[PDB]
Structure formats: C-alpha cells, structure tokens
Design a protein around this ligand. Structure first.
Ligand code: BOH
Ligand code: BOH
Length: 130
C-alpha cells in the first residue's frame, strides 16, 4: 500500500543518516570501501561474504532493507568479518578489532536511542505480511 511505502521510505532515510554518520567517523575509514584484492591479497581466502559501508548504502538504495534488524545484520557482518580477518595478537590486528567493535557498538547505540520501537515494530509487521 501507499502508506507502507511511506513507512519504508522513512526507514531508508533513517538508515542513510546512520550510515553517513558512521562513514564520516575517522575511526571507521577502513570499513568505508570494499577491500581491494591488490592491497590485501589474502582477504578473499578468509572472508566469504564481504561487506562495507559503501555496499550498505547501495543496498539501502536498492530497497534491500525493510527492517532495522536486516540493516544491523550487515553492520554485524562488517564487524565479524574484521574480527575473523584480524585474529592475531599483533597490534595491527588488535587496532582493527577495536575499531570493528566500536563500529558495531556505535551503530547499536544510535539505533537504541533514535529509532522508535513502534516504528521498527511496524516495519517488521509489514515485512511478515509479505
Ligand atoms: C578492514 C580490515 O579487516 C582490514 N584488516 C586489516 N588488517 C591488517 O592490515 C593486518 C595488520 N592484520 S587491514 C584492513 C583494511 C581493509 C581495507 C582498507 C584498509 O585501509 C584496511
Ligand atoms: C533492531 C533490533 O532488533 C534491536 N536489536 C538490538 N540489539 C540488542 O539489544 C543487543 C544485540 N545489543 S537493539 C534493537 C532495537 C533498537 C531500537 C529499537 C528497537 O525496536 C530495537
């Protein structure tokens, strides 16, 4: 219905705003673009489903997220990929892990404070009806 499409458009506006605030944070620069094989050759060996903040923006605009839960699954994938690719005690690994945990925590904290629970419930109920 037209009212349901208005609901999903508001969700997209919200998700673009959250994603933009993550992408401009200097701590999260490493998560802003897809990993380039020429700069990180062994990445494809470890990471089966790559994800980054530019890919998240593309998915918003392709109407792939109908709930904030679906969006947070991709934020969580950005973080879990970073933890999997950076498991060692070396400081380069530990720095990326710290930033990945901060990305996850920051996204969840923004959503917990700024997303109305009834709005998310409406999105989920529309999704379950389709
Ligand atoms: C995001 C990620 O998992 C990632 N991990 C690294 N780990 C390392 O360099 C070594 C120290 N474990 S570099 C890196 C990365 C990826 C894209 C751009 C960029 O500037 C950095
Ligand atoms: C989208 C969702 O299912 C969701 N997941 C959370 N994760 C947690 O509580 C744990 C995993 N940190 S908080 C949260 C949430 C946040 C705001 C409004 C709302 O209705 C739900």
């Amino acid at each position: 219905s037209m009212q349901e499409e208005d609901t999903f458009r508001e969700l997209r506006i919200f998700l673009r705003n959250v994603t933009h605030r993550l992408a401009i944070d200097k701590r999260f620069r490493v998560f802003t673009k897809p990993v380039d094989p020429d700069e990180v050759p062994d990445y494809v060996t470890v990471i089966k489903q790559p994800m980054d903040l530019s890919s998240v923006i593309s998915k918003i605009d392709l109407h792939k997220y109908l709930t904030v839960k679906d969006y947070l699954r991709d934020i969580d994938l950005i973080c879990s990929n970073a933890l999997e690719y950076n498991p060692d005690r070396d400081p380069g690994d530990r720095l990326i892990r710290h930033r990945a945990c901060a990305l996850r925590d920051t996204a969840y904290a923004i959503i917990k404070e700024e997303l109305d629970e009834d709005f998310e419930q409406l999105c989920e109920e529309i999704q379950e009806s389709r």
